[model samples]
Target: MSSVQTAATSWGTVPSIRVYTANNGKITERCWDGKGWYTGAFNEPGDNVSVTSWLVGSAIHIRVYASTGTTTTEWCWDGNGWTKGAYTSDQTAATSWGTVPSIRVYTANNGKITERCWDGKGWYTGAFNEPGDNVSVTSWLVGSAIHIRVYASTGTTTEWCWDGNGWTKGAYTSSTVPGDQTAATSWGTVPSIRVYTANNGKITERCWDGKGWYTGAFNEPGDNVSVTSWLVGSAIHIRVYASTGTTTTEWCWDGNGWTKGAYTAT
Candidate 1:
């Protein structure tokens, strides 16, 4: 096993969280069906162990590197069963935004990162700027814009926005770098974002409002291992592996205070 990815979606009123792992060469799933968690296999074999996922309404969109070509494949949950999506060529590490029929994928073409868009009727590619290589991009759809956080190889992160037109980049922080991390956002009363980073033995949190980025807090004494993030409604959950490197912990934030427990044990 290499990493775990958690994607949350609501089927009608019941919320479901599916955790994914590129176990050995196969993709496995452990899902919480609003009541309890159950384990299963997603079953796509790939060489790249790094997988990412997100919610597009009721569908759980998961993308991983293809075992064969220079491309990647996607599998989605249609509330009933897993539906295989067509292979996306020249892209990897895709993060999703928007919903069904119409959705978007922010992915990389080697060292260049760009987008692929699916309107309700057809599919197209976003001819926006292909930012430099080093990645870790996650997005949230707010109003008419799709906001993205892309990490640079230099340890700096940048915020980019696609406001129905083109893409514009914004700066994230000064030096509070994200060595191994992921980001999630909440579009509650006030729009906000939290970035979780594995800084050696500590889990650091940096955040942003409408103003700018600020170094917020830190969480713990673990190795610089894999981290996953998800936004459950107005709450932000950043998950990290525990010190034993076997157990897991989820740092939750919705109100002002913080709550730590099992990874999205909802």
Candidate 2:
């Protein structure tokens, strides 16, 4: 129960959900203003939080895990006071893809799967393709295309894409043996990707609509280890923790597919 994230703003014409959890140590922003849920605060304590967030135009960009010097900053929530961008410390798992202002952070020092970009100004970062170092990674950036998914250590599952000009290593490998996983991407008009793994308790879905890669499964064996996902317009929302994390069971994908509900969390 350390991290939980989701992004999709514009509460006027419908597109809600802007949650960013990590409570007890700080980091709370859950504003579902259509009728309920409200709160906003960010000071970030950081000691194994593993945070992430996205939404560029309306600006709610975050990337925590900055215990003042443990590094990996970037917290810019417009309409408020926050701006600490510029990273490179002990990077932790962080993902983003609100269509653009992209960032996907992680560093095995030299094992790659690193990305930290933002055009129209500045910022850059580490290696981008190793695909395996005994893996466990998740990344998504759809406008210019950059996707990643790796869950290795002999469990075997891989994916890597960067259709902006380079990096392509996804020869389709899904031996399925993941314990905890998460991923999301899609905003309509043809930007797609979905991956949610944690198969022992059942949930192994992988789909990519750019060229290849496909598979789907969920809710069968039963205790549902952990999982996470988010996306607003093009549809893809998932949450799968367990009774231990207080419980959660909600899934969706309205481009015509996946609809599993019965959610709870406390």
Candidate 3:
């Protein structure tokens, strides 16, 4: 078997797979066809081993980090072969969603976070922007609805979501920087979001449960918050932690109302 450096599975109707890796110091790819994997010996010389790949409908999107670490090159498989895009920074993330299968790529360049999306017919880059450095992003697809969130070091978080035909930008929540990582899951087609931010020595929680969004403070007061979520039956379970005192709290929703739990570990 050829060395498989990184691979991504297509979420299309039939489901396909794409693989990318180094071949004699040049970037090469291979695809699976039930029987076996075959490399076309496709080469993009001078590219690094770091690859971020995904499939959006009929197109396969891949980005390779250049040797410089500061930049990268975008390549896509247009249902046929690979096509290269302009060089961009290595701080990037992408996901595919929508009725027709499109791609959205996010990058942190300069002091802002920007997005570029492929709308099937063509690519529309940077339809919106969010402010921050050391930015991080996450996206989820519930049918054709796409939810994208960005977390920045400037102490802020922003959200943009696609509701079928158009995109809606969620309000920016402030005093929420220094926020920890986020967690998201869906109850059927409805989406739930969880995030934490420092509030004095206490922690503040933000969440969205289908119908609307809500915020609350943890039951116990302590510094630092860690967030996690899981889907149990029809309910979505959320838990948060206070690191200073080694305490944990949990919240759950069953498409009806909110439930809370408090506890401390020894």
Candidate 4:
């Protein structure tokens, strides 16, 4: 029999995953192979990519184009060539939040990370590592407090910090395993599971109920993983992450142990 060989193809386009945060709220855009959403003409346009400062509106508009340019530039199609095109159909708005003159994305460059907003509050720098991974602010609001989340690549060893709080640490085990990535889910009115995954493939989820942090569940899987968390309602949220081995999913608890979820990612 003749020998068989495998074939692989590479696209000229670079793949990227991004989450956009605007004055109204946040939205997600993804790029795979050569297709994209909320992707600008040249490189990643960052969050709220296509959203413009509205003259009088609370919603933010997101669009995908071939390339981005100055005010004179128009939307371009995505293909082998650049041509004027249409946009994705959907508008995001955080009605609870007030309006701003414009929207800005917080990105890490050189040795620092900064936040830029449309309220005339230009870029404000924060702690960042050298050669840091770029960040995408998932949402923003104007009020007594500001809630922002950032997304960076897992290729690097990165940490997150809140204003004066500094880099928040996760739980650690006696086996030299340090909890790193966190994915959270909630229930009722409590911060349900703050799922923590260590580099050693150990998984542990803790919970909080507006009072203190508590442990909920633990799983030891062997693989590399990425996780994401969100607060959907009072004590309800969703978590999504992936690993290399047989995937396992579960719900956190206050008493017994974990209540397994219906699905698991492989």
> What overall lDDT goes with each candidate model?
0.51, 0.47, 0.48, 0.31
Q: List the residue pairs that clash in candidate 3.
A: 155-177
lDDT of candidate 4? 0.31
Best first by lDDT, ranked: 1, 3, 2, 4
Error of 1 at 106 (Å): 2.7
For candidate 3, lDDT tens digit of each residue in 93-129? 4555544555666665566767766665766665657
Candidate 4 or 3, higher TM-score:
3
* Per-model TM values vs. the true structure: 0.71, 0.28, 0.45, 0.37
Model 4 clashing residue pairs (backbone): 24-94, 41-66, 41-67
lDDT of 1 by residue, 94-170 (tens): 45555544455555455566666566565577665555443455566667666655553333545565545666776
lDDT of 4 by residue, 1-266 (tens): 01110001111113122222211222222222324333323333222233221212422232232112211122322234334332211111110123443343343433344443334354233443322333322233424444333333234323343333443432322222332333322233222324344445555544455565566545545233223233323323233333333333323222354444333221
Cα shift from native, residue 158, model 4 (Å): 11
Give the Cα error of residue 194 in candidate 3, in Å.
3.2
Task: Judging by lDDT, tell me the better candidate of 2 and 4.
Answer: 2
* Top lDDT prediction, candidate number: 1
TM-score of 1: 0.71
Give every collision pair in model 1: none
Candidate 2 lDDT, tens digit per residue, 153-245? 222555655556666666655556533443333334354555555544555666666677677644433333334455565455554333223
Q: For model 1, what is the error of residue 111's alpha carbon versus the real structure, in angstroms, after optimal superposition?
A: 2.6
State which candidate has the highest TM-score. 1
